[PDB]
Design a binder for this molecule. Structure first.
Ligand SMILES: CCCCCCCC/C=C\CCCCCCCC(=O)OC[C@H](COP(=O)(O)OCC[N+](C)(C)C)OC(=O)CCCCCCC/C=C\CCCCCCCC
Ligand SMILES: CCCCCCCC/C=C\CCCCCCCC(=O)OC[C@H](COP(=O)(O)OCC[N+](C)(C)C)OC(=O)CCCCCCC/C=C\CCCCCCCC
Ligand SMILES: CCCCCCCC/C=C\CCCCCCCC(=O)OC[C@H](COP(=O)(O)OCC[N+](C)(C)C)OC(=O)CCCCCCC/C=C\CCCCCCCC
Ligand SMILES: CCCCCCCC/C=C\CCCCCCCC(=O)OC[C@H](COP(=O)(O)OCC[N+](C)(C)C)OC(=O)CCCCCCC/C=C\CCCCCCCC
Ligand SMILES: CCCCCCCC/C=C\CCCCCCCC(=O)OC[C@H](COP(=O)(O)OCC[N+](C)(C)C)OC(=O)CCCCCCC/C=C\CCCCCCCC
Ligand SMILES: CCCCCCCCCCCCCCCCCC(=O)OC[C@H](COP(=O)(O)OC[C@H](N)C(=O)O)OC(=O)CCCCCCCCCCCCCCCCC
Ligand SMILES: CCCCCCCCCCCCCCCCCC(=O)OC[C@H](COP(=O)(O)OC[C@H](N)C(=O)O)OC(=O)CCCCCCCCCCCCCCCCC
Ligand SMILES: CCCCCCCCCCCCCCCCCCOC[C@@H](O)COP(=O)(O)OCC[N+](C)(C)C
Ligand SMILES: CCCCCCCCCCCCCCCCCCOC[C@@H](O)COP(=O)(O)OCC[N+](C)(C)C
Ligand SMILES: CCCCCCCCCCCCCCCCCCOC[C@@H](O)COP(=O)(O)OCC[N+](C)(C)C
Ligand SMILES: *[C@@H]1O[C@H](CO)[C@@H](O[C@@H]2O[C@H](CO)[C@@H](O)[C@H](O)[C@H]2NC(C)=O)[C@H](O)[C@H]1NC(C)=O
Ligand SMILES: CC(C)CCC[C@@H](C)[C@H]1CC[C@H]2[C@@H]3CC=C4C[C@@H](O)CC[C@]4(C)[C@H]3CC[C@]12C
Ligand SMILES: CC(C)CCC[C@@H](C)[C@H]1CC[C@H]2[C@@H]3CC=C4C[C@@H](O)CC[C@]4(C)[C@H]3CC[C@]12C
Ligand SMILES: COc1cc(NC(=O)c2ccc(-c3ccc(Cl)cc3)o2)cc(OC)c1
Ligand SMILES: *[C@@H]1O[C@H](CO)[C@@H](O)[C@H](O)[C@H]1NC(C)=O
Ligand SMILES: *[C@@H]1O[C@H](CO)[C@@H](O)[C@H](O)[C@H]1NC(C)=O
Ligand SMILES: *[C@@H]1O[C@H](CO)[C@@H](O)[C@H](O)[C@H]1NC(C)=O
Length: 1102
């Protein structure tokens, strides 16, 4: 009956929340059981008058019997309860269609994994070959004076961290300080879980790199242990590893999703005067909203009392005005008509909350309620189409797409509860191992439901491997692997499905004339143009020599002085020649000649100051910094870069408007964050030597007390570098949370936040995490959907304007594209003629059959399996046996190739696959003899090159893609899309170079802190390039911004004994803030364009 079902639905709802709650008093569960056994009895009576329900009854009876002996315990009983409690949730009419839709998504992704795991295995084998046992390298002290190791190996900790320092014996690897030599130890960096020593560890590391979870940490470790050059590895892999796989995941799901939805008296006078309401009143309302917004966006830590009083008076006046509009409108319409509109109820509730706050006015009382007035900006949407669109996206997410949100929330809840129950006792009895040095609890644990939900949400943000390391050290490793991997895969699947759906559904539902002629002819000629291109390239390249060490090279500096003056003379003459050749009107109406003119003007001003006695003046020294804009002249010449920039310029107008709405939305969040956290991020630290430790609340609980106890001089009252004290800084804080780098530091301070001038306490405001959660869900998450949708429809309209012509490719790249497209479609090639000779004919008969081909593939698979068993520090005998096996394999493949050549004389060389195995065979033979000759008869070179010589066995592995249809097709799609990626990568390389010049001139001095160390700094072109590549993907950009945000002790030496240029260990916060933010935004736009190009390419191929 209906009443029976409703009883069942409510009791299970009680359990959802009942398990969410710990410390059951063993009285709630009993009251629940009495009820469930009565329901089971009546169900049995009905049944006499499904097997799963029968099994549930058996489980409950088993628990009833088990209360006497070994009560509770094990782990599984609670997890068995939740499945039964979850069936009712699953029964919702709409959820079943959605999960059926999702199964198709995993069936479509099938082909992608076949290729994803193949690529991960191949690059994991490469990484195993190159870096096995290199992450075990550590800086070990020497001895003064022999049995085994002299005492325990005393390592050193890198500045600012407790981790042992990783070094190398190479020139570009990394070196130990004085009194320290590199030794390969037995312990690996993180928890002995980060390595390249075996195929399992290498596969885990490559999977971490594919998702880019803290990948910059592994980047630095391997480049510090092996050498800077191996960054190229990490470059080639990172792009294909993350970018390419996402290209497929998205396309392969997006089409699939589209597929399915392609299948489907005085009162009368008051009423009159209220109806008298005219458009001149609406403008007043909007004006009041804007002025209130700007007044509320004017709060900061350092407000004067008069400043605060004026803000308070203004806020009251506005609240009175809005209450006035309420009382006018209610007695203008009727309240039944009034309370029928959707916006009227919203206005009513906001102003009611505002009046309630005006009533109970305590300093800090429910500050969240003081920011609901900000919601009134949403009323500024009936005239702004974009804000309305954002609201439509959210409403579509809630109402029409509600089932996806429900399944995502249920997945998060179920997995958090399951992990809490399985792993919970472990995080309390083992908490010492995974906690920070001076803390007594891990910051991310699973003892209680809130923290389990936080860990699940953080995994949904892409940060899972560190928490996995923490849990594998506290509990069972297999449980961690299963839990974290399933959570990550399943949650990312659901989130991408929700995101793509929302975009697709909401968004898409007389002598002078002769001289002029001669000059024009001279300019038009191609040699002149090539000369100018060559000069631009040389001018750009010379800028890459002006690093921190130029002052030590006396000749180089002088050479550049001449190089820069002669180049300036060249371009001024070139401008003069063009001016005479084209004419003034044509020149000054070109939009490229203006760029050349401005750059030449800057260079000429710098040179004129250099010749004069104004080289040291403040503004000229700032124009000298704009010598990094010279490479843009190269962008002018090259046509691919011109095409890409033209697209960027066409897109810009829409990104302007979308950007404005994002700023308005963030401004709301920043005002809320200032209301909550402004001035509460200050805390005392003990700074002794490059390391700061938070002063404990026992000895010092108050600001004043640090001054009282500062006998040593080591105690400093400091504020977090990025904070909500100021609204502008708040946007930077929000940006870090949206990027997901540096988001944690801001959050920990907010959770520890207490009253102003009060020492922060461990997790005293633990429910402030929710605020950040809401931001991530509503701000970055909603805005990014709008941003992507706007970019997509802009792309569609622009390509339709072209006539559908593909953008990002030059005209000759179009011809290459057409030829490459025609290549892939030709089926017939004709049968190859049979050999006339009996012996050649017999070899032909042997080689032509499919059995030979299958035998060759299974042999290569065996070779692959033989290659997966290589491990660091394995044995001598194992190495010899593997070498003999490799010799047998190479002999077999050599013989096979010879047989093929005999059977197929010229037809062999005709096919490209045949050319490819021939090349791999020759490479393997050359590798095998080469390695032997240096060892046998030549001076012993570095072993690390041998590790590179044996990289010729991977070609035999890549021979397999001959057989697989999906992988071959995907590879063909990538090949087709390469030409446009070339131009976009050229633009990205130019941007990186310019930024490197800007960083190498503006940031080399900065104290080594956080990301900035002896290898990743801005003192050299290569060092800046490494930093730029790392932040290209936004990884670890807060780590480089942090040292630049330092403006005094204990992080700076006010004047310093040795620094003429900046006179400090100080970095420029405005420049750094501007420099880092601009690059990430530009890189994000470029990478979005690359996504668009390759996904369109995949769609055309499919
Ligand atoms: C903090 C920021 C969090 C959320 C942003 C909420 C934006 C509110 C907009 C109210 C618009 C409204 O009031 O009216 C819009 C129309 C009325 O016009 P009508 O077409 O109905 O006629 O309605 C519609 O169409 C669209 C209906 C859109 C419903 C959006 C709100 C759904 C839930 C929002 C809050 C979620 C929990 C947040 C917890 C924070 C703590
Ligand atoms: C506007 C939005 C911006 C919000 C910014 C964050 C503001 C947080 C303010 C705050 O400081 O908030 C505190 C409340 C207190 O209540 P408590 O939950 O800590 O009580 C439990 C008490 N103790 C711990 C003893 C068991 O926390 C709460 O209201 C939030 C927790 C309950 C609300 C979420 C319930 C589930 C929602 C959706 C599920 C789908
Ligand atoms: C199929 C999977 C087969 C996996 C390889 C065999 C299992 C294995 O890993 O054990 C081979 C032993 C290992 O000895 P170990 O030097 O690693 O010592 C241990 C490390 N330590 C030095 C710290 C004591 O090697 C030996 O005895 C000689 C056997 C070496 C050949 C291994 C199997 C080659 C065949 C592959 C498929 C074709
Ligand atoms: C390196 C990484 C990426 C570079 C990939 C370059 C190879 C892809 C190019 C594919 C291509 O442009 O194909 C077009 C045609 C073959 O197409 P088709 O089948 O119609 O035959 C042509 C004969 N017809 C027309 C009678 C059927 O021209 C050809 O490919 C002829 C050249 C065949 C490809 C030679 C590639 C050699 C590169 C590496 C080999 C060593 C690998 C191991 C390296 C160290 C370990 C990893
Ligand atoms: C920041 C970044 C810095 C720079 C990063 C470096 C960028 C490197 C970029 C790309 C490198 C790989 C790209 C080329 C892949 C070529 C694969 C290939 O060209 O094959 C596919 C074709 C397909 O032919 P289909 O009949 O199936 O038509 C397909 C039927 N439809 C029309 C439906 C598709 O096959 C053929 O053309 C047969 C003729 C070709 C035979 C030799 C070609 C294969 C040689 C090597 C391939 C190994 C690729 C390894 C990729 C990484 C793996 C870990
Ligand atoms: C739709 C749902 C999809 C769900 C997909 C994800 C499912 C993931 C399942 C993973 C199962 C893993 C089973 C083996 C784990 C138990 C064995 C184990 O001990 O693990 C831990 C090992 C390292 O151990 P250790 O430090 O040497 O200590 C060993 C000692 N004997 C001890 O127990 O103390 O650590 C390792 O062995 C490293 C293993 C790396 C594995 C990398 C897998 C990548 C994921 C797949 C990516 C492609 C998609
Ligand atoms: C939505 C989509 C994404 C939007 C992302 C917006 C990111 C904007 C970040 C703006 C940060 C502004 C900011 O942080 O000001 C603050 C900085 C700090 O300087 P200070 O000397 O240490 O003084 C500290 C003291 N608390 C004080 O400010 O008093 O004060 C400064 O000195 C910096 C002033 C200039 C900052 C200009 C930032 C322009 C960024 C351009 C971003 C768009 C690029 C396209
Ligand atoms: C494409 C157009 C933009 C780039 C224009 C061409 O830039 C090429 C430079 O990267 C060449 O390398 P460098 O000159 O930086 O290398 C020398 C570095 N040291 C050794 C002198 C420090
Ligand atoms: C260890 C093994 C890990 C999982 C390895 C899983 O690999 C299984 C796939 O190869 C199954 O695909 P098929 O055998 O149907 O062939 C591919 C289909 N095409 C490409 C021919 C169309
Ligand atoms: C970032 C991603 C970098 C991918 C870098 C991809 O590099 C592949 C390019 O070498 C392919 O270029 P094309 O063969 O199309 O060359 C045609 C262009 N020119 C040379 C004729 C003008
Ligand atoms: C800062 O905090 C400390 C500790 O709470 C305050 O010192 C206490 O003040 C009360 C006042 O009745 C005494 O009874 C306690 O014995 C004091 N404890 C001490 C000495 O730590 C201190 O007054 C607060 N104010 C300042 C100076 O900022
Ligand atoms: C708690 C605060 C910060 C979040 C924002 C307030 C939310 C929860 C409330 C306040 C006013 C409410 C809106 C008032 C108007 C309507 C009626 C109908 O047309 C759709 C729902 C909708 C649009 C409501 C959605 C939820 C709503 C926006
Ligand atoms: C019918 C066809 C045209 C619809 C195609 C929808 C495509 C273009 C949508 C669906 C999902 C979207 C992607 C979702 C996530 C990201 C990651 C972000 O960092 C770059 C943009 C990118 C890559 C989006 C680009 C646009 C996108 C790929
Ligand atoms: C080397 O080739 C490239 C790889 C990437 N790869 C990425 O993996 C990535 C992930 C997240 C982001 C990203 C996220 C947020 C912001 Cl604000 C900026 C960037 O980028 C991106 C490239 O674009 C230039 C080029
Ligand atoms: C580094 O070189 C020193 C000799 O300078 C040597 O003793 C040490 O073992 C080397 N370490 C490695 C792993 O190369
Ligand atoms: C934590 O360290 C203790 C030693 O204090 C050790 O016994 C235990 O095994 C460690 N944790 C785990 C999960 O092994
Ligand atoms: C704090 O500073 C003192 C020196 O004044 C030092 O001796 C002590 O070890 C430091 N402690 C911490 C917590 O870093």
């Amino acid at each position: 009956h209906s009443w029976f079902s409703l009883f069942i639905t409510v009791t299970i709802l009680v359990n959802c929340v009942c398990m969410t709650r710990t410390d059951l008093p063993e009285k709630i569960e009993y009251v629940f059981t009495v009820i469930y056994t009565f329901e089971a009895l009546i169900k049995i009576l009905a049944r006499g008058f499904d097997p799963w329900n029968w099994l549930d009854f058996s489980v409950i009876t088993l628990a009833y019997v088990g209360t006497a002996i070994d009560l509770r315990g094990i782990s599984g009983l609670r997890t068995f309860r939740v499945l039964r409690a979850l069936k009712t949730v699953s029964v919702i009419p709409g959820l079943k269609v959605i999960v059926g839709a999702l199964i198709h998504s995993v069936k479509k992704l099938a082909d992608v994994t076949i290729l994803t795991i193949f690529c991960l295995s191949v690059f994991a084998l490469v990484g195993l070959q190159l870096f096995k046992g290199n992450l075990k390298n550590k800086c070990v002290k020497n001895d003064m004076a022999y049995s085994s190791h002299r005492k325990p190996d005393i390592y050193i900790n890198k500045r600012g961290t407790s981790d042992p320092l990783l070094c190398g014996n190479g020139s570009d690897s990394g070196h130990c300080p004085d009194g320290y030599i590199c030794l390969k130890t037995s312990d690996n960096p993180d928890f002995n879980y980060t390595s390249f020593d075996s195929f399992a560890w290498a596969f885990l590391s490559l999977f971490r790199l594919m998702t880019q979870d803290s990948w910059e940490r592994l980047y630095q470790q391997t480049l510090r242990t092996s050498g800077k050059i191996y960054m190229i590895f990490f470059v080639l892999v990172i792009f294909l590893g993350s970018f390419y796989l996402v290209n497929l995941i998205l396309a392969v799901v997006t089409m699939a999703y589209e597929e399915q939805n392609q299948a489907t008296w005085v009162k009368l006078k008051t009423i009159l005067f209220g109806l008298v309401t005219d458009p001149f009143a609406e403008l007043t309302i909007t004006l009041c909203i804007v002025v209130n917004t700007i007044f509320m966006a004017m709060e900061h830590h350092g407000m004067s009392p008069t400043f605060e009083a004026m803000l308070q008076i203004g806020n009251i006046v506005f609240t009175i005005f809005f209450t006035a509009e309420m009382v006018f409108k209610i007695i203008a319409f009727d309240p039944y008509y009034y309370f029928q509109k959707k916006w009227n109820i919203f206005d009513c509730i906001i102003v009611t909350v505002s009046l309630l706050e005006l009533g109970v006015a305590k300093k800090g009382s429910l500050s969240v309620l003081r920011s609901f007035r900000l919601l009134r900006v949403f009323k500024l949407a009936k005239s702004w189409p974009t804000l309305n669109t954002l609201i439509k996206i959210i409403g579509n997410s809630v109402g029409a797409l509600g089932n996806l949100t429900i399944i995502l929330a249920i997945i998060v809840f179920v997995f958090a509860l399951v992990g809490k129950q399985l792993l919970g006792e472990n995080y309390r009895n083992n908490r010492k191992n995974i906690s920070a040095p001076h803390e007594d609890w891990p910051r991310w644990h699973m003892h209680d439901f809130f923290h389990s939900f936080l860990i699940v949400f953080r995994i949904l943000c892409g940060e899972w491997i560190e928490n996995m390391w923490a849990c594998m050290e506290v509990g069972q490793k297999s449980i961690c692997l299963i839990l974290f991997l399933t959570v990550m895969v399943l949650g990312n699947l659901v989130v991408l499905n929700l995101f793509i759906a929302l975009l697709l559904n909401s968004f898409f539902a007389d002598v002078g004339w002769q001289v002029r002629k001669t000059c024009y002819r001279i300019v038009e000629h191609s040699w002149f143009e090539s000369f100018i291109i060559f000069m631009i390239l040389l001018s750009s390249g010379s800028l890459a020599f002006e690093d921190y060490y130029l002052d030590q090279k006396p000749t180089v500096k002088a050479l550049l002085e001449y190089t820069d003056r002669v180049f300036t003379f060249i371009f001024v003459f070139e401008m003069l020649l063009k001016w005479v050749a084209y004419g003034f009107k044509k020149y000054f109406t070109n939009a490229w000649c203006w760029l050349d003119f401005l750059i030449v003007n800057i260079s000429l001003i710098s040179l004129t100051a250099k010749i004069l006695e104004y080289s040291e003046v403040a503004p000229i020294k700032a124009l000298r910094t704009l010598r990094a804009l010279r490479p843009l002249r190269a962008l002018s010449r090259f046509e691919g870069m011109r095409v890409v920039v033209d697209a960027l310029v066409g897109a810009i107008p829409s990104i302007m408007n979308v950007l404005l709405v994002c700023l308005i939305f963030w401004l709301i969040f920043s005002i809320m964050g200032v209301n909550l956290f402004a001035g509460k991020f200050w805390r005392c630290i003990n700074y002794t030597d490059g390391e700061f430790s938070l002063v404990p609340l026992s000895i010092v609980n108050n600001k004043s007390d640090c001054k009282i106890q500062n006998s040593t001089g080591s105690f400093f009252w400091v504020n977090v570098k990025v904070n909500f004290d100021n609204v502008a800084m708040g946007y930077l804080a929000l940006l870090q949370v949206a990027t997901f780098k540096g988001w944690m530091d801001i959050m920990y301070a907010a959770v520890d936040s207490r009253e102003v001038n009060m020492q922060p306490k461990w997790e005293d405001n633990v429910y402030m995490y929710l605020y950040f959660v809401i931001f991530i869900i509503f701000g970055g998450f909603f805005t990014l959907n709008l941003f992507v949708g706007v970019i997509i429809d802009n792309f569609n309209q622009q390509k339709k304007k072209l006539g559908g012509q593909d953008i990002f490719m030059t005209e000759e790249q179009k011809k290459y594209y057409n030829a490459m497209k025609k290549l892939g479609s030709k089926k017939p090639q004709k049968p190859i003629p049979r050999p006339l000779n009996k012996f050649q004919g017999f070899v032909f008969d042997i080689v032509t059959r499919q059995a030979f081909d299958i035998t060759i593939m299974v042999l290569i698979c065996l070779n692959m399996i033989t290659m997966m068993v290589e491990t660091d520090d394995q044995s001598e005998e194992k190495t010899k046996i593997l070498g003999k096996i490799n010799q047998f394999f190479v002999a077999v493949f050599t013989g096979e190739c010879v047989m093929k050549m005999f059977a197929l004389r010229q037809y062999y060389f005709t096919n490209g696959w045949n050319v490819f195995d021939f090349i791999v065979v020759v490479l393997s033979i050359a590798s095998l003899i080469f390695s032997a000759i240096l060892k046998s008869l030549q001076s012993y070179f570095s072993p690390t090159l041998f590790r590179v010589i044996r990289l010729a066995r991977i070609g035999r592995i890549l021979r397999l893609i001959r057989a697989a249809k999906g992988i071959r097709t995907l590879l063909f799609a990538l090949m087709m899309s390469l030409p446009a990626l070339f131009n976009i990568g050229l633009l990205l390389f130019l941007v990186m170079f310019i930024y490197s010049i800007f960083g190498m001139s503006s940031f080399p001095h900065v104290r080594w802190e956080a990301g900035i160390d002896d290898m990743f700094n801005f003192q050299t072109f290569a060092n800046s390039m490494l930093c730029l590549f790392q932040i290209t993907t936004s990884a670890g950009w807060d780590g480089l911004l942090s040292p630049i945000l330092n403006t005094g002790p204990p992080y700076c030496d006010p004047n310093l004994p040795n620094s003429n240029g900046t006179r400090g260990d100080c970095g420029s916060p405005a420049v750094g803030i501007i420099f880092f933010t601009t690059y990430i935004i530009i890189s994000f736009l470029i990478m979005v364009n690359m996504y668009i190009a390759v996904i369109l390419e995949n769609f055309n191929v499919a």
